[PDB]
Every structure is written in structure tokens, then in C-alpha cells.
């Protein structure tokens, strides 16, 4: 039995070996308790305000929209401590771990941002943090690895399988199945087995709550659409959650198109993968015809989780949210555009969301539309990537 529904329509669930079920059940009980505890809420809100810097700004982009009938705002998760939205939910999950009397955190990371977010939350709250990272990733994300180690986390390179994110996920879970009495597994997106899609949404929902308050204050109405990139689904579901019941507000999720959907080299499982069961959940994923799990490809490594959160698959199926893709080249153009016209360097992840909004504006410049893009992170980390591409051109 569970306290909460582990499924969103046919998607989600708890597809883990039997030995991990007590860990998930314990976590669900702790979360349900925490959500009813005003003291927990107050402590979380306090860290978000006074450590992470919430609320984040909502910035209008007149320079980009000039001469069209689009009004565009960026929700500034790039201004959160750590430079990306991932900080919100790691602080909530670190508090949950403390609530459960856990003194140790396990996390996975691919492009290193969840690793850094987990390490900073663990440093603040005095937890012993160990991070699993595919050896290939350890090699290509040395700045992030160095950050994790500065913050006192142990970074464990994963050699098994293909030595990437999914192998790091597997090592984290194997460890947790043995250590869950004393360690919490701080999963890095709104995916994996229940209760993680639910917990991560709830600990990111202030993105959309704030956006709603700020847009009402500045424009006196709700947005026509909110737009967010979708790697695993956390920043998008955090922006979307408070608007789900506002049926006039469009919810647009942007998966990475990589070199183009037709090339096969993309990271868009929701719209171009096939439902499977892996990562503890039933969800669309990148997989071979005979059911071996594959990789997502994007210029942005942070969008490379090869499946997607089950609530996104559900919101798509019922037509409440629409999902699209943006290619590497479109993301690069949006990155350049924001730097030049607003003086903001966006994460290449977030640049996928911005690119779609720019398309919405440019394709129909006399359409009245009030848009919010979730600017999930800053793009300092991407300047070498962008430099190298632009130089080879």
C-alpha cells in the first residue's frame, strides 16, 4: 500500500527490486508527514529565502520582443544560489533526510550540476555526501567535479556499463539498497520511482507559484503560456505545477532535438521515444527496438537523461501540456540572442526554452501573447562549449 498515488495515468510506479521498497515507503511516509508539518515548511522556506536567495526575479525582455506583439518574461532561476533551479529541491530533500534521521546523502550526476547541488546542500546541512558519476562524465565535467570536492563531497567514478549517467544512477541505487537506514538517496529530477516525481515537483513548485504572483502583479493577468526545457522534468514541472488548474495557461515543455529528430541524434523521448520500464518507472524512453536502454544526445549535457518524468508523459497524453523540441543550433542562436540583447548568459539547457519562445514570436509576430520562459540556469558553464562551436565555423 502507498499513501499517495504512484502513477500519473499509466505512467510512473515503483519498478524497483523488492529490497528497495521499504526505502521508498519510508521516504513517502516522511514526505507526507513533512508536507503537513508547518515547522518543516517554515525551515524550508527559511533556507530558500536566506541561503538560496528566493524569490527570484521575473525579468521582461523588451529588447528581444520589440516590434512584435509578444511580451516575454524570464523567470530567473539563473539567479538562484548555485546558478540553477536544482538548488531548490536539494535543500528540501536534505531537510527530509534530516527529518528521517539520516546523516548521509547519496546522489547521481551526469553533467555534474545535480552533483554540485547535492554537495552544497549537504555541506550546509552537515551531511556526509557521496556522489556517483560515470567515469566518462568525470572526464568531461572536471570543473563540476572540483566543485563537489571543494564542498567536501566524495566523488565516486563509475566504471561499470557505459560509464555514464545511467550507470551512475544504478550505482547510487545499489548503494542505497544497503545503506538506507542511515543514507538518503537525493535523486536529481522529477523522475525515477514514486515518491520521487511527486517530491521533486513539490520542492520545485515555488518556481510557478512565484511566477504566478509576479505576472499578476506586473501584467494583471496570467500568462498565455509558460515554457520550460525538459531533460528529466524538474524545472518544467516546477514552473507548470501551480498553473495546471488554470486551464487557459499553455504549458510547453521543450526537449532537446540535438542534431535534429530525423538524425536519430536527439534527446526527445517523450515525443520520439517508446514507453518502457526502467529507472524505477514506466515512461517514454530512448531504447533500441529490442528494449536496451540508449542515450539522449544534446549539445547540453544537462538534458541527457534518456527518459522523462511520468507526470510530463501524463500531461501530454491528456493534452494539458504540449511538448516540442529545439535543435542544438536553435539553442545556440537563443544563447547568443540573450547575451547580446539582454546581457544575460543562459544555460544551454534553458536556451532550448528560450529558443522555442523566440520561434513562437518570430513565426507569428502580430499574435498577442504573454509568455514566460523558465530560465532554469546561468550559462557561464557553457561558454567554452559555445566558444568552441562558434570558432569551428
Amino acid at each position: 500500500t502507498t499513501l499517495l498515488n504512484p502513477y500519473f495515468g499509466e505512467f510512473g510506479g515503483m519498478y524497483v527490486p523488492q529490497i528497495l521498497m521499504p526505502a521508498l515507503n519510508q521516504l513517502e511516509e516522511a514526505f507526507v508527514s513533512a508536507q503537513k508539518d508547518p515547522e518543516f515548511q517554515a525551515q524550508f522556506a527559511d533556507l530558500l529565502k536566506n541561503y538560496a536567495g528566493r524569490p527570484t526575479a521575473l525579468t521582461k525582455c523588451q529588447n528581444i520582443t520589440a516590434g512584435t506583439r509578444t511580451t516575454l518574461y524570464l523567470k530567473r532561476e539563473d539567479l538562484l544560489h548555485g546558478g540553477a533551479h536544482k538548488t531548490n529541491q536539494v535543500l528540501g530533500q536534505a531537510l527530509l533526510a534530516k527529518r528521517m534521521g539520516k546523516s548521509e546523502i547519496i546522489a547521481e550526476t551526469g553533467a555534474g550540476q545535480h552533483g554540485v547541488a547535492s554537495a552544497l546542500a549537504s555541506a550546509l546541512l552537515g551531511l556526509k555526501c557521496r556522489i556517483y558519476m560515470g567515469a566518462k562524465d568525470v572526464e568531461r565535467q572536471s570543473p563540476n567535479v572540483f566543485r563537489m570536492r571543494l564542498m567536501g563531497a566524495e566523488v565516486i567514478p563509475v566504471h561499470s556499463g557505459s560509464a555514464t549517467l545511467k550507470d551512475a544512477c544504478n550505482e547510487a541505487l545499489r548503494d542505497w539498497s544497503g545503506s538506507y537506514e542511515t543514507a538518503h538517496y537525493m535523486l536529481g529530477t522529477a523522475a525515477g520511482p514514486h515518491p520521487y516525481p511527486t517530491i521533486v515537483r513539490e520542492f520545485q513548485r515555488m518556481i510557478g507559484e512565484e511566477t504566478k504572483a509576479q505576472i499578476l502583479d506586473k501584467e494583471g493577468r496570467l500568462p498565455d503560456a509558460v515554457i520550460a526545457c525538459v531533460g528529466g522534468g524538474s524545472n518544467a514541472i516546477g514552473m507548470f505545477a501551480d498553473f495546471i488548474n488554470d486551464t487557459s495557461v499553455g504549458l510547453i515543455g521543450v526537449e532537446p532535438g540535438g542534431h535534429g529528430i530525423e538524425t536519430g541524434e536527439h534527446g526527445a523521448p517523450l515525443k520520439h521515444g517508446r514507453v518502457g520500464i526502467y529507472f524505477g518507472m514506466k515512461a517514454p524512453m530512448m531504447q533500441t527496438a529490442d528494449g536496451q536502454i540508449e542515450e539522449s544526445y544534446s549539445i547540453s549535457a544537462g538534458l541527457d537523461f534518456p527518459s522523462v518524468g511520468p507526470q510530463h508523459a501524463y500531461l501530454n497524453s491528456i493534452g494539458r501540456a504540449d511538448y516540442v523540441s529545439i535543435t542544438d543550433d536553435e539553442a545556440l542562436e537563443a544563447f547568443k540572442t540573450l547575451c547580446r540583447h539582454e546581457g544575460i548568459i543562459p544555460a544551454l539547457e534553458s536556451s532550448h526554452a528560450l529558443a522555442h519562445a523566440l520561434k513562437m514570436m518570430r513565426e507569428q509576430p502580430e499574435k498577442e501573447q504573454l509568455l514566460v520562459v523558465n530560465l532554469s540556469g546561468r550559462g557561464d558553464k557553457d561558454i567554452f562549449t559555445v566558444h568552441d562551436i562558434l570558432k569551428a565555423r
Binding site: Y15, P17, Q18, I19, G161, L173, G280, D290
Partner: protein, 253 residues
């Protein structure tokens, strides 16, 4: 077919436990895997547990992860696994054959079609490693519709509700992880228990049976002999033969 029921009845008559090797199909290649399996049987394996190579074998340790990698290096696919299974059953009509599967391979071309394929090639049971009993309904129903026993892990800390579910839903045998659980399972009329995980010596086989389990499963110990002897397939088979013979002897009355 009731191959597990028949085996356990026969073993019971002989006051004997089952010894059940675990190997990965197609490790280290198709032809050598078939030989390995024939060797395990000819050395006295009572039943088999066989893994289908999967990209992300979460619930397996390094030895078996490596076995999967070896099989993939040989280009082994689930389709090839099913061809091997048919050939194995064709050679060996009575030995119970159980698969250790991950959910995606079962769900991939449709859960019903997967179990129908198991029935066609003469498999007896399927343990889906990453389907907990709480979410097993479509799997165990499809299994039973196709005369396949669904196998469930019973963890050493299992609570009473979990014991009751495992006893009700499982068939063939209960997979018990390494005397109280054994007695509760018997109380709740569960399928006979096989003890698995870290069984690597005759003494542990004997201990499992003495505790009241119907037998013991060994995988890492067996696959290590494969890994050890990759360069010498002939010696590989001799060493497998002597190890299985010793382990089987330890189950005898």
C-alpha cells in the same frame, strides 16, 4: 507441465535439496554458453536460472554485470536467448528452467507476448528483478495464463504483509535471500523456498537445506569460473563440472 512440482516431489522422496546454478545466456558466446549449460546439467544441476543480457542490470553485482558485457560483446540479443532456450529444453525435457529478467525486456514487445514466447520455448518460471510484488499484477497474471510460474524475492526482513503476498502470488519456488522466514513461508503455504545470494561452497548448500529450504541457488560462484577461464574453454567446462558436482553432492541426504 508442472516441472518444479515434479522436481520437488522427486527430491523430497530422496530426502534431497535442489542445487540450482545461475548463468547468463550467451556468456561468453552462444556455442560456449550452450556447452556450459549442458555441463551444469550433466554435473547434477536440478534446475537452472538463466539471465537474459540487459543494458542496465541494476540488481546484479560486478560478476554478473561482466557476464552481460561478455554476452553483448558476442552480439547476443533476447531473440537469440529464446533460440537457445528452445534448444536447451529440446535436449533436457524435465529440468525446470527459470529466467531472471528485467521489466523492460518483458514489457518491450508486450507482456502477454513475452510470456507466450516463454511458454513456446518451454521455460518454467520468470523472476522479474525490478517488479516488486505490490506492482506485479500484469506480470504474474500473464505468467500464469501461459503456464509460467512468477517468482518473487522474499527479503530477510520481510514483514508479515509481504510474506503473505509472496506466499499467495508466487509459484514454482519462493526466492529467499541469504529459519523464521522459512517456517512462516511454509505456514502460509508458499511455493518451496530456494535460498540464493552468496552461496559459493558445499557447506552453504548443506546449511540452506538444514534450515528447511528446498535447495540453493548459486550464480557468482559459477560465473567466476567462466570469467577465470575465458582463455581455456575446455578447462572452463572441467572446472564447472567439478564445482557443480561438489555443490550438488552437498544437497544429498
Amino acid at each position: 507441465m508442472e516441472r518444479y512440482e515434479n522436481l520437488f516431489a522427486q527430491l523430497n522422496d530422496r530426502r534431497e535439496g535442489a542445487f540450482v546454478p545461475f548463468v547468463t545466456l550467451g556468456d561468453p558466446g552462444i556455442e560456449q554458453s550452450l556447452k556450459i549449460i549442458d555441463t551444469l546439467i550433466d554435473a547434477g544441476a536440478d534446475a537452472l536460472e538463466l539471465g537474459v543480457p540487459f543494458s542496465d542490470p541494476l540488481a546484479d553485482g560486478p560478476t554478473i554485470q561482466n557476464a552481460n558485457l561478455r554476452a553483448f560483446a558476442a552480439g547476443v540479443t533476447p531473440a537469440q536467448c529464446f533460440e537457445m532456450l528452445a534448444l536447451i529444453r529440446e535436449k533436457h525435457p524435465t529440468i525446470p528452467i527459470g529466467l531472471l529478467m528485467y521489466a523492460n525486456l518483458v514489457f518491450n514487445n508486450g507482456i502477454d507476448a513475452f510470456y507466450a514466447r516463454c511458454e513456446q520455448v518451454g521455460v518454467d518460471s520468470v523472476l522479474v528483478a525490478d517488479v516488486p510484488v505490490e506492482e506485479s499484477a500484469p506480470f504474474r497474471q500473464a505468467a500464469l495464463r501461459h503456464n509460467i510460474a512468477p517468482i518473487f524475492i522474499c527479503p530477510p526482513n520481510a514483514d508479515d504483509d509481504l510474506l503473505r503476498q509472496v506466499a499467495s502470488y508466487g509459484r514454482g519456488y519462493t526466492y529467499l535471500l541469504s529459519h523464521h522466514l522459512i517456517e512462516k513461508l511454509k505456514e502460509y503455504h508458499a511455493a518451496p523456498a530456494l535460498q540464493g545470494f552468496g552461496i559459493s561452497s558445499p557447506e552453504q548448500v548443506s546449511a540452506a537445506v538444514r534450515a528447511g529450504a528446498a535447495g540453493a541457488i548459486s550464480g557468482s560462484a559459477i560465473v567466476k569460473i567462466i570469467e577465470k577461464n575465458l582463455a581455456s574453454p575446455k578447462q572452463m567446462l572441467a572446472e564447472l563440472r567439478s564445482f557443480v558436482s561438489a555443490m550438488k553432492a552437498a544437497s544429498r541426504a
